[PDB]
Amino acid sequence: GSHSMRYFFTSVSRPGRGEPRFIAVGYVDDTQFVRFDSDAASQRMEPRAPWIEQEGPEYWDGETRKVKAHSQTHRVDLGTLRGYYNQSEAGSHTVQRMYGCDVGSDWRFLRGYHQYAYDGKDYIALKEDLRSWTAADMAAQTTKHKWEAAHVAEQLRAYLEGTCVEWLRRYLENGKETLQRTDAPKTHMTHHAVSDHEATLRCWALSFYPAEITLTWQRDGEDQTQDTELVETRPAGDGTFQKWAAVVVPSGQEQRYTCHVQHEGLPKPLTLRWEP
């Protein structure tokens, strides 16, 4: 159904070590398609998915110019923010930026966002209406006034509602073979005795795309979120995701417990039950 394009940018200052680190990455849903790294040899926007490789030298020359203008903006911003907070030149600081657009199952514009963080905290965000800003503190109000005076919101909104959704549609068509896929989790349950009175049940979800999933244990149809050991969804490294959830049960009572799997790739949610 719904799809997204997102760009992520990090800038880290290097006290007494010259130019800041800069890393830019682009995603369609959970699939990285481009990157730029200041530490890499090319100093170009590079492809990271097969379907973007077919874009011509005009695309690559244009993305290179625009990523370097982002780099230059972040370069100035780290100096400006050190000024705004009167921080010493001795310490490393971080700017993070994320922007992008969501489309619905009709591939029509659903929402756009632009967030900016200084040292791991909200600094300024575009509001849902894409017409104004929320500034976290007194320093960010300075930025907010500069962006109002220069009508950034109007030109950012034209990108998020226009260009962003048009190129997302182009990429979805050019990448159909891999971007439009939903891979349902391959699921199984393991059972390991801990003692003569207790046992661990572990519910596995493997080879799923996208990353969004719910794994939940119920006892007699009632949630067990107090006693569930849960790992964070993790990349397999081949474009799919893995997750597991475990519960410690009394021996002889395994059949009271059900593992519930919800995923976009499933016609309907799975219930799994241990049977010897």
Partner: peptide, 9 residues
């Protein structure tokens, strides 16, 4: 495709 309009804070 990148936004071409980012502005200094």
């Amino acid at each position: 495709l990148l936004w071409n309009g980012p502005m200094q804070v």
